[PDB]
């Protein structure tokens with residue numbers, strides 16, 4: 001397999017780029033959800 | 049995967065063969081916190097996700113924009129709120 | 145044994161190439177879907 | 193709510209902030225000579241490769257369809273930039289720098305074909321000189337392969353192995369000319385890309401649409417124009433430091449260079465053969481076994497090309513999505529202001545401008561940014577006279593000088609309640625504050 | 632590149648032994664008499680001495696072999712003030 | 728001083744300068760950091 | 776070159792290819808460059824009896840002195856040497872079936888090397904101020 005060349009390096013690189021795209025996408029979704037959100041410090045889960 | 053359980057999880061067999069699923073950079077708990085923040089941003093001041101007005105008024109103005117008079121709409125506010133929370137309960141019970 | 149192992153290496157490397165190609169296509173579909181979800185958040189949840 | 197009033201932080205002062213956004217609309221047009229890549233000059237390899245049938249014809253066909261699709265995409269982006277643009281023939285950028293105290297000199301290159309390739313703006317020049325491998329960069333790099341230079345450029349090694357990047361059908365100078373025409377089409381009559389009105393008035397109407405009274409806008413026109421040109425300068429100076437858009441453009445170039453380098457490196461893989469060199473195999477083995485070794489190299493190199501073609505098809509689909517989004521942003525943020533909240537960048541979007549960028553377009557989103565805030569008690573509605581309900585338009589009802597008045601939601605400026613800033617209702621809703629003495 | 636290289640992080644052993652008159656029999660046993668295996672890498676200090684201000688180069692001589700008997704070749708690398716004399720001969724190696 | 732260490736068939740990342748002198752080297756299987764250096768073919772790998 | 780020691784006579788790249796050598800007999804050093812390889816971009820029109828050839832990123836002197844001598848007329852364009860096409864970059868066309876790249880087109884009536892301008896500004900003579 002080492003004599004085959006850079007086949008495994010290419011497979012790892014494509015999967016790493018794909019996973020980097022998913023991570024960047026998840027950050028963009030989270031940024032979109034949190035964009036412009038302003039909350040009061042007086043908010044409580046138990047009473048409101 | 050390192051436990052002594054007789055039931056061999058197929059995910060453990062895949063991981064020992066180099067196939068593994070890594071967790072996302074943001075946990076689903078963090079995304080749930082973000083959706084919770086985006087949801088409460090519509091019900092309380094300053095209504096940062098509801099056009100800067102109370103949620104019931106946003107519902108009333110949105111229904112009025114479809115061609116519904118403000119008279120029946122603000123006289124039936126409790127019927128509209130009950131219809132709205134019944135629709136939400138119908139969505140929740142639809143997962144069963 | 146090298147001949148037998150080379151046949152297995154070719155089969156397993158072809159398997160990884162096929163899986164990687166499928167994964168690239170699927171992540172493109174997920175990116176399109178995530179852009180749609182962000183657009184729906186912006187144009188249906190934060191505003192109408 | 194105390195009584196019928198809530199506490200809200202309403203802005204008392206504001207500024208204009210500029211935000212960049214690079215959207216990739218193009219990709220380097222990579223062309224592979226499958227015959228020259230797989231077999232170089234060696235007749236013994238070409239004879240074997242011919243037995244695989246139409247493999248290289250299929251690779252060439254898929255890359256040609258992908259490159260034709262990139263060309264079609266670039267034509268559609270240019271058509272979108274030039275759609276509806278009408279300019280005065282008396283217009284001359286060498287004298288018409290700025291209008292209404294807003295300086296567009298850095299966003300405008302020379303207008304008309306008599307200036308040649310000089311239609312690139314100062315802003316676009318500053319963006320293009322930071323990227324070496326543009327369309328002109330690739331043309332210059334490939335021009336230097338036969339210039340007798342002792343330097344072994346990796347692009348020259350790739351081209352001699354059949355991997356070369358062709359220039360796009362429209363030069364980046366033409367696209368900069370189109371972005372320049374689209375930019376000047378918003379500052380001068382007939383304002384064909386600014387809703388047919390002066391640019392300062394369009395900015396003022398856009399800021400007023402966010403809930404800001406016209407009085408503060410038309411008395412602070414100089415402050416708004418200076419804030420706008422300072423936002424423009426902040427965008428320009430942002431490229432001299434680590435920037436997300438400049439890094440995104442360089443990532444496009446680096447991803448292409450990495451893919452081309454990986455494809456070239458596949459020529460040095462042995463694929464289980466005695467050597468990765470066809471010359472070494474042919475200088476060591478007789479035809480019956482040389483054929484066995486060359487077949488392994490052909491199989492490995494054809495597998496590598498198939499994997500590269502599949503990856504290129506996926507990447508070009510992502511570029512099509514990016515170009516469709518860029519055309520939509522040109523149409524709905526530059527030529528007009530569509531009623532979509534976070535489509536044209538984050539925050540209170542006022543207006544957007546476009547500039548050419550290597551393999552894409554740079555969008556410049558100008559937003560209304562509050563500087564200072566005031567906590568005030570507001571009422572979302574009032575019950576007046578004969579129980580008639582009134583709701584504020586893009587604002588709130590407040591108590592100022594112990595009287596009910598209206599203020600915009602994006603700027604604190606109390607003004608008297610009138611039909612101009614009110615939605616009337618024949619019956620007031622419950623919980624609307626009772627104000628029987630109003631109007 | 633793949634070649635005959637030292638293991639990074641392993642320990643060098645200073646096998647140089649300096650004496651004046653007496654020689655210890657323990658100096659000619661393990662661990663000083665070491666196994667060659669694939670090979671060895673040596674870092675040797677050039678002990679630069681001075682006689683009437685004139686510089687002289689001195690360092691330990693290394694022998695490589697098997698049984699060290701005159702029916703087998705022994706490699707010897709010995710320095711002579713700037714001349715590295717290398718021989719491989721069927722030497723009658725001494726006990727000490 | 729005569730320091731000795733055993734030799735073995737090992738893969739090394741050898742760095743040559745502009746005058747052909749080996750200035751630095753990495754034993755690829757010696758440690759995890761050496762494995763990263765050999766994988767990236769760089770003395771100082773990028774942060775990641 | 777000065778990097779060859781007494782025991783060295785061959786220069787190699789990172790990929791194991793020979794790229795230079797010091798001759799054993801004359802001690803003279805040479806750099807090895809691969810012989811030029813490339814493609815010809817040929818523009819063809821169904822109504823024409825010939826081809827307009829573009830030797831991409833090559834000068835006409837290099838094509839004539841190191842690839843092949845031809846009887847066809849030629850000139851050095853921005854994209855490389857162009858054969859059998861009249862240099863008319865001042866002229867422009869809104870439609871182009873033979874797109875060479877970088878805003879250049881090949882137009883047939885003989886072939887003409889002409890700029891490609893698919894989009895133009897609708898101009899008006901109205902006042903600017």
Ligand SMILES: CC(=O)N[C@H]1[C@H]([C@H](O)[C@H](O)COC(C)=O)O[C@@](O[C@H](CO)[C@@H](O)[C@@H]2O[C@@](O)(C(=O)O)C[C@H](O)[C@H]2NC(C)=O)(C(=O)O)C[C@@H]1O
Nearest residue numbers: 645646647648649650651652653654655656657658663728
């Ligand atoms: C491997 C080792 O242990 N090597 C050391 C060596 C031995 O331990 C010592 O030889 C033991 O004996 C054995 C081998 O059986 O000791 C050395 O140091 C000596 C003192 O230990 C040194 O000062 C000598 O002291 C004298 O009293 C004497 O004869 O030993 C007088 C002599 O004139 C003088 N030599 C001079 C001036 O160099 C040495 O050299 O020999 C330094 C070496 O690094």
Ligand SMILES: *[C@@H]1O[C@H](CO)[C@@H](O[C@@H]2O[C@H](CO)[C@@H](O)[C@H](O)[C@H]2NC(C)=O)[C@H](O)[C@H]1NC(C)=O
Nearest residue numbers: 289290291292293294295390392393413414417
């Ligand atoms: C109103 O019109 C005047 C021209 O009559 C404009 O004043 C010019 O503004 C430009 C741009 O800042 C300056 O370069 C000129 O020097 C000004 N000329 C004069 C005579 O003052 C003014 O900008 C216009 N104001 C608005 C908001 O439209």
Ligand SMILES: *[C@@H]1O[C@H](CO)[C@@H](O[C@@H]2O[C@H](CO)[C@@H](O)[C@H](O)[C@H]2NC(C)=O)[C@H](O)[C@H]1NC(C)=O
Nearest residue numbers: 779780781782783784797798799800801802803
């Ligand atoms: C080529 O270079 C070699 C090495 O520098 C030269 O060989 C040396 O020549 C001198 C003078 O004849 C001898 O004293 C040395 O012993 C030679 N060998 C070495 C390794 O230094 C050689 O003369 C040069 N020229 C030719 C024509 O071979």
Ligand SMILES: *[C@@H]1O[C@H](CO)[C@@H](O[C@@H]2O[C@H](CO)[C@@H](O)[C@H](O)[C@H]2NC(C)=O)[C@H](O)[C@H]1NC(C)=O
Nearest residue numbers: 308849850851852853861862863864865866888
């Ligand atoms: C190909 O033809 C073009 C036509 O424009 C030549 O461009 C010349 O450019 C200079 C500088 O702008 C002008 O002064 C000339 O008037 C242009 N020439 C003509 C004929 O008008 C270009 O030089 C030609 N190139 C070759 C190698 O023939």
Ligand SMILES: *[C@@H]1O[C@H](CO)[C@@H](O)[C@H](O)[C@H]1NC(C)=O
Nearest residue numbers: 204205206207412415563564
């Ligand atoms: C608004 O902010 C700017 C910058 O701090 C300042 O120059 C200006 O005077 C402020 N205006 C008001 C009304 O506070």
Ligand SMILES: *[C@@H]1O[C@H](CO)[C@@H](O)[C@H](O)[C@H]1NC(C)=O
Nearest residue numbers: 329332333335336339341345
């Ligand atoms: C091309 O070569 C010339 C002369 O060596 C050099 O000045 C120029 O910068 C080079 N350009 C590129 C892109 O290699």
Ligand SMILES: *[C@@H]1O[C@H](CO)[C@@H](O)[C@H](O)[C@H]1NC(C)=O
Nearest residue numbers: 820821822823882883884885
């Ligand atoms: C090409 O030939 C056809 C058929 O004679 C004709 O319709 C067409 O106009 C010609 N076009 C050119 C550019 O010669």
